[PDB]
Ligand binder design. Structure first.
Ligand SMILES: [Br-]
Lengths: 58, 114
C-alpha cells in the first residue's frame, strides 16, 4: 500500500541519481540499494526500475 | 537503515531562510566514500552529494546560489538542507534520500505563506 508506494518512490530516486552520476562506485552502490528494495518488496514497478538502472552500470 | 525527519511539515514565510533536517544513523566515524546525499523537490535536483563531492552542473537553476548542504552536520548524521530567501515556487514536497550502508528517504511538505 503506502509502504510499497514509498518503495517505488525511493526506487525512482535511486535511478535518477544513477543516471546523473559519474562514479561507477556510486552507481554500483545505488544499484545494490535497488536490488535490496527488489528483494524486500518483490514489486513489478521496482523491478522495471531496477532493469532500467542496470543499463547504466557500465 | 532508517532516515528520519524531526519536522515533516514546514509553514514558511516569503523571504525566510529555511533549514530542513534529515537524519541518518552514524555509529562510527563518517565514511565519506560510502555516503550519497540527495535532495529534490518535484523533479528539481537540489543537492547531489556523492562520496564527498558535488557536481555544480547538476543542480537545478532555480536553486543555484540559494540551496546548500550543511556539510558540517554530516558527521553527526544530519543531512540538513538550507534554502535562502524562500519564494512561492519553493512550496511543495521536498525529498531527502540518504544511501549509507542501505538506502531510505523522507518527504517534507513545505508551504510558503505570503
Ligand atoms: Br515519507
Amino acid at each position: 500500500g503506502p509502504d510499497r508506494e514509498r518503495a517505488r518512490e525511493l526506487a525512482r530516486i535511486l535511478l535518477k541519481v544513477i543516471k546523473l552520476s559519474d562514479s561507477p562506485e556510486a552507481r554500483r552502490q545505488l544499484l545494490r540499494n535497488l536490488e535490496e528494495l527488489a528483494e524486500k518488496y518483490k514489486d513489478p514497478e521496482v523491478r522495471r526500475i531496477l532493469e532500467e538502472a542496470e543499463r547504466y552500470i557500465k | 537503515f532508517t532516515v528520519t525527519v524531526p519536522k515533516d511539515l514546514y509553514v514558511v514565510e516569503y523571504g525566510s531562510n529555511m533549514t530542513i533536517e534529515c537524519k541518518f544513523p552514524v555509529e562510527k566515524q563518517l565514511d565519506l566514500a560510502a555516503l550519497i546525499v540527495y535532495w529534490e523537490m518535484e523533479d528539481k535536483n537540489i543537492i547531489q552529494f556523492v562520496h564527498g563531492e558535488e557536481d555544480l552542473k547538476v543542480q537545478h537553476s532555480s536553486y543555484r546560489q540559494r540551496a546548500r548542504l550543511l556539510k558540517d552536520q554530516l558527521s553527526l548524521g544530519n543531512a540538513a538542507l538550507q534554502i535562502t530567501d524562500v519564494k512561492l515556487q519553493d512550496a511543495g514536497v521536498y525529498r531527502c534520500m540518504i544511501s549509507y550502508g542501505g538506502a531510505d528517504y523522507k518527504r517534507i511538505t513545505v508551504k510558503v505563506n505570503k
